[PDB]
Design a protein around this nucleic acid. Sequence first.
RNA 1: AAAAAAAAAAAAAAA
Lengths: 593, 593, 585
Amino acid sequence: AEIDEGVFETTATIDNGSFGTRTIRFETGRLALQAAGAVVAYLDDDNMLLSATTASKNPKEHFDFFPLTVDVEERMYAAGRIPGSFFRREGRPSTDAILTCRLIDRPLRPSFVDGLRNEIQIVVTILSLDPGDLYDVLAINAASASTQLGGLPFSGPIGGVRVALIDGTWVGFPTVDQIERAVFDMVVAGRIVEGDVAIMMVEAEATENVVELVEGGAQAPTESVVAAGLEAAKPFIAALCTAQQELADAAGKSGKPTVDFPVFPDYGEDVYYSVSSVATDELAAALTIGGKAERDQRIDEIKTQVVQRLADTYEGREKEVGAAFRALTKKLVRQRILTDHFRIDGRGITDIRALSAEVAVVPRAHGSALFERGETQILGVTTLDMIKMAQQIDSLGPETSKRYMHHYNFPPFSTGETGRVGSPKRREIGHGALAERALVPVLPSVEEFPYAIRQVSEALGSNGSTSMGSVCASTLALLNAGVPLKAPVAGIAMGLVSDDIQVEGAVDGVVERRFVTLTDILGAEDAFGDMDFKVAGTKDFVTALQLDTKLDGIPSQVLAGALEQAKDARLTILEVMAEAIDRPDEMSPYAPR
Amino acid sequence: AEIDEGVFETTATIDNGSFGTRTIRFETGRLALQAAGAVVAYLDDDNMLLSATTASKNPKEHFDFFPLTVDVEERMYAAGRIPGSFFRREGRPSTDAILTCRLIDRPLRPSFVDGLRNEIQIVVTILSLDPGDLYDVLAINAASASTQLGGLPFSGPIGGVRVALIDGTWVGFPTVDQIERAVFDMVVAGRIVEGDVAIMMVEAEATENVVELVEGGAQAPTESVVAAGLEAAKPFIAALCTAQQELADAAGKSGKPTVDFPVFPDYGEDVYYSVSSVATDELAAALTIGGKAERDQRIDEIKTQVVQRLADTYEGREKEVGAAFRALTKKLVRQRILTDHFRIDGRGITDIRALSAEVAVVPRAHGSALFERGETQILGVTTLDMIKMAQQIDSLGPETSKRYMHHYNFPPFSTGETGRVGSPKRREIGHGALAERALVPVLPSVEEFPYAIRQVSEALGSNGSTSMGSVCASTLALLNAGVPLKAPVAGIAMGLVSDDIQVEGAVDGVVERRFVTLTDILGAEDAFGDMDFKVAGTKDFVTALQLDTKLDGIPSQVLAGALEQAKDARLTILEVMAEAIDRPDEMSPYAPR
Amino acid sequence: AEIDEGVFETTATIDNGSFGTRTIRFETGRLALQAAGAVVAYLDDDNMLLSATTASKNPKEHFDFFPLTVDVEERMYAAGRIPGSFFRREGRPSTDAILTCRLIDRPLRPSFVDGLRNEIQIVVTILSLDPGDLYDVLAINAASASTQLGGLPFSGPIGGVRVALIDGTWVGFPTVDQIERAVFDMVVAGRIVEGDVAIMMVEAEATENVVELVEGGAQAPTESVVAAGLEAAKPFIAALCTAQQELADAAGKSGKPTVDFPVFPDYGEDVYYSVSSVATDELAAALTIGGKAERDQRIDEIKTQVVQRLADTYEGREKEVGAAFRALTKKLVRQRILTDHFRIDGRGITDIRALSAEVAVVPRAHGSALFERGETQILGVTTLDMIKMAQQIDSLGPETSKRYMHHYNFPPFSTGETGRVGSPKRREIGHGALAERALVPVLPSVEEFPYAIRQVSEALGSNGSTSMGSVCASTLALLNAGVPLKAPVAGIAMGLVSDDIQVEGAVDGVVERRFVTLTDILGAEDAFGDMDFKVAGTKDFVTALQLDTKLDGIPSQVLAGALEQAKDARLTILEVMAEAIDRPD
RNA sequence: AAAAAAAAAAAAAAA
Ligand SMILES: O=C(NC1(C(=O)O)CCCC1)c1ccc(-c2ccc(NC(=O)c3nc(-c4ccccc4)oc3C(F)(F)F)cc2)cc1
Ligand SMILES: O=C(NC1(C(=O)O)CCCC1)c1ccc(-c2ccc(NC(=O)c3nc(-c4ccccc4)oc3C(F)(F)F)cc2)cc1
Ligand SMILES: O=C(NC1(C(=O)O)CCCC1)c1ccc(-c2ccc(NC(=O)c3nc(-c4ccccc4)oc3C(F)(F)F)cc2)cc1
């Protein structure tokens, strides 16, 4: 809709029945005209933000990865307030902004064509905010729309939404007051494939009042309830994708990309062909050894022989043969998993690594614990203090103080490297936040436990999913310090592989999709997998959930089976945890009163 | 004067008649003897500072610009107290120090020979300061003197002074108490060229008491008054330059450079000669293409044709040919401007680009506005708060708090680029300070309007002079918020092109030198010019002024005409501003009372 | 001792007689199993910390120095409280952690083989701390143990300890309460050579109550007392080294280096031989000529005429020949020093450079002074304020406030260079701390002088030991501001050169070891010497001491003579300082 | 410092 010469606008509607209706509006052609693409997004006439996307003129070939950057700029004037810092100006980004950056980055990054080496930057500025609303999902939609209008090698619009379960109804785009009445709230992002929605990213948590609401008669958020909630977000995503596509069509764009971006593949087909024809049988036979040192030595020897021969042949292309060898290895391993239920370390597909749990490991700490799962090793420490030491928050959003704080540390020696030790990175912030949300619904209230609580996790050893081990260590350490939890919490990380396998016969056209689910995946198994997801909770309901994938679709029964398998693993881990400690201890003599 | 063996000193006197007399003293040969040059400067034997200049041993020519660096170090013991921060130590430079750094950098950088690639660093430390004095103008002279003593390829001494207008007298080096009785305050820097002073830098503003002083019977600072102020500053500059030269002569120095610094010109003579002979007539006729896209297409076609022709001849020297082509293009465009008032975009000499102004653009802000001039687009937003939210300042200078704050942001997408989004750079600080000084003299007093005020400028699009559009946006947004200003303020950026060309006679050796003034210059037009300046004010008097040049001299009539042209331009802009809003609105329901 | 499967343990005992006994435990095999080496250390089962060492997979030859990094992580939960900053999280390292990093880095860095270019990182995390103890000396031992278990080209275990003098007894690992009753506090680190302890690093200071305790009957810490304190620390170091070696033996390790690390020497043997055989006699003759600028120009032309005739013989190896030429110059100069008592600037071995002192150089400052020694030039400024302006400290250690603050600045132009001006580096922090500790013992009490004091030193010109010059400048400025010091303090920096020399007999190969001590060394002389040390104090006792060395041993009489020479220089400097000012203004 | 031109397991020194 060309409201003005050169200005176009589009609208999407969110219908919640008796809970109200909301409108989302996209506008282009009036602000930031020198960017590659720019869009203004409105929610209900009082929420307003701007998104802009630009690309660099020339690529950076010497990089080995795609350089995408996302930035979120919160302005205090959006809340009608002057900043409280000493210099009265906005400084380094807050935790909320970093989490929003991660939420945008997770689904957009795999949507670009592989091999791209130009720099892409996306900047989102918050301009006006109603005191009872949240801006993050609107930001996801605006970033997608501006990138779509930028005319880049970018795959289709992406839609995002939040849904909260209230009295048996999944409400879309709820307010803070409404979220205060729900048992579960979930952020979901996806795209449209062949007229259907394919889910790409999920980030979900139980609310802080879930136990009291369930005692009052509400439904508890179990696995099937969460699956139904995933089903209820698809129409909203479809409406948002349609509005974005209409905006792109109205304002020209669509076809004629004009600017062409070169791509830099890791290896050429000619190099890959030689490596396959030379080392297929050797690699296939070598995997059956399964002896760690013997397996590694055989792999290294075959790699050295192949690289020597192909360096004699291709005359100075060593990285390409190295990449092709790894690709062939991964291709063989995936087929072996799908055919024989073979895992790289010899476990069955439902087996957990060796487990151990201990408490009281640090002499003068208020509480501490050590948790081990295979080569993953987490140390947790708890400290209690007076309630005035709660963190005071001066951000744009509605939060004003934080009674319970969780900090996560990942040093370089955890995997045996060297590196800088300094301020935490974005991934550390994300993992810490996910582990923090898993414990919040089970903490006691302030009136019955008047203390500030700080929890610290140290990843002393890493071989896959330290964030799920932080949950278990947090539970054990909090119980060791005398905090009266409502129920213990545990977590697990899971993977999924899938591909087309020909059934016993002929005609080579009866190949059908086949899926396999793996429990407690290794660090290397994540690269071979097709979907990753982490689940945490008590023995009665789920408290945190995270997911990201690339598949075009997933049958409902496959997802239900995977969720059930994760629940079984969680129960097994809770049984081991209970043997170390099963009730709160006495408070430490060193802690205050 | 050799007061001590190896120690020399020189004096300059500044006579203000009935307002007093002051002396500036330069000393060398005592402190910091391992630097290339070092000088100590005194003002009235209680203000004392040190300046030192050093150069790197080897050139580093993998850069394309001259690497000069200026640093100012404020020591809190110069005011006699311990720093108030948590660690009791001076940290990041304050705003005043950054502004002093830029005042030093602006005149000194073009005074070095072109092609230099050695790193040059200047450090100025403030050692002792009287409570009623300002140190910046003293620092300019010290920075010039220490560089002059270092035996570098540096063109002559530079003198700097501040003049303030009090009761019809222009007083040099005034105190803080004297500035409270003045209507105008100007900082001027220049050099000596054949017995006469050539002005190079100006930074000037109207004082905070100008309106009531003019109501009391003082003369308002109009354009002719400002020009008389520039005339009054020359004798002080001449005296300071003479003192510096005398000190340089007394301590040896003078000649005998000893160390020789290599230079790295952009292009050689042969390449320029070839490029000129190949394309002088092709470029001369190709400027007539009014169409922007057609113009640039023809330009790039000609450049590529020249590059392909000359690639084989010079074995591949593409940088030199690219530089020579641009040099020839600029040389021809300047001739077209001087001969027949040609402009690159087709405007006439006194034409402004298309203007637009609008208010009430951000839904929940206290006040907001959008201002557009050509491709320059500025968004301004106002916030009001309680008086306790004024900024508290802890610095060397006499200022202790700020009731009105202005912050200016320049994101990479405004030009279409990618880059870091972090703390603001020095140029952002400078532009914001200029725009703040433009609006200070018309604000209401605290007794009349008891609020703290924060103003933010976002440069959403930029093609030349965003700082002057910040002034218009600030006035519009402040009126939208309900602030009762005494008068609206507008600003404009101006250019000047000069050269001597053949007169309408014979011989081909008789040439007259002419000047052309351009209104509202583009970003590209700044590189074609010999002077650029900016003027802001009301319909009655000037409030801010900035000027940079490197011309040997400018006749009085030329400068008067340029200032009159700028006045007409800002009056035209004020008329357009008044249609959008001409009186204060009602204060927002969201603002406090 | 394998307490658990894969876990090994070892113990060391520190016996202080009637002052008590303490135990240190080392444990390995249970925490951080993916590092190259990791060790947990305990002191009396309430103090616990962890140390881990890792190495990079590939070298990096584009550097020209050995890249070693040391990090100390103080966790506030070790003290049982939440951090007080706005974000409630630990940020940049505090001054204490940086000084602990320096204490670890000083003795460990020269213990690696020459030419190593792999990156090496050591990280020490503080987990539990008793309120009356100090963790730094424990950290030294833990870092040594984890590096020794890592299987790297590392030269033997290193042991560190603190000893304090209380009522005539040197007590090892004293508590905070015990330090309040002592006159001197000293940190010492060393290693074992053929059954004996060789000292490598020393960092010592007098306490804040020394004057009052000496007035009450205690013995003042003179030079011989400090020398005896060095002897008293050796058995403790031996016991700690033994425990570390036992732990290394128990958990495998010991031999079998397995992974091999390439080395990158500055020059090859052939290049050095070619450079020496072409220029030895000529260079020695140039050294024998008594002239500074003449020898400078002669050497500069010799370098040009030697690089030019070997450029064809060695293909693009100019850096190798330059390094070999510099090494040969160093060897000849050291030989000349040991034989004829030669110094490059012509001074005698007990001579100080030209001195000058002046006060009241900054017009509005509360106190100010300018101090010059040779090309070293220091400016010092003092400011006084209300006692509420004292620094408030929130950290693991027992300190909570700081009445006297000293800040040291080292701008690039003091050498003639260009560089970044900004946050102070670790070396600036260390030098400032040494200068602050030298002056703390003579300050008046808060009761008789109720002010906060900030002292700033700025190295306007540097050619060797600005740290000791800042002590003199601070004394002068404090007196100029009116602070009633109990006594003035001065300092000096000293060097020592040692090597084997031919006897006056025969056989051509019968040699003896000789030592020579130099007063007030230049920056260039620090590279020639085998040991360097700095001493500061009053006319009656020592207040600060710092020492670094690599020698396998030092006879007692040689060290006593060196300390006496330093004391004589200190007295001369105090006499020059008394002329400028001899009482508070 | 002058100028429109982040993803992932992958400090030492006068210089
Ligand atoms: O912890 C982790 N991440 C976090 C978590 O909490 O989870 C903690 C911090 C944030 C999240 C983590 C994640 C990934 C890894 C990992 C390590 C190694 C390999 N790499 C191979 O694993 C391999 N590489 C080869 C090969 C290479 C070149 C040529 C030929 C072969 O072969 C093989 C073969 F499969 F055999 F083992 C993959 C992943 C470890 C830990
Ligand atoms: O917005 C601004 N804002 C600022 C303000 O406060 O003002 C904010 C902070 C300071 C600035 C700004 C915006 C753009 C510019 C700019 C200037 C020059 C060129 N350069 C060409 O533009 C060009 N390059 C060629 C050429 C190149 C290669 C070969 C041959 C020819 O030709 C040409 C031809 F002149 F014709 F147009 C571009 C942009 C400056 C300022
Ligand atoms: O100020 C200082 N302050 C510090 C302090 O102490 O607190 C502050 C914190 C720590 C230090 C300081 C100042 C200067 C130095 C320094 C040392 C060595 C050299 N280097 C030569 O000096 C040389 N280089 C050659 C040569 C070069 C090329 C080829 C052949 C020979 O020859 C020679 C020859 F020995 F003759 F003099 C220069 C400067 C050290 C410290």
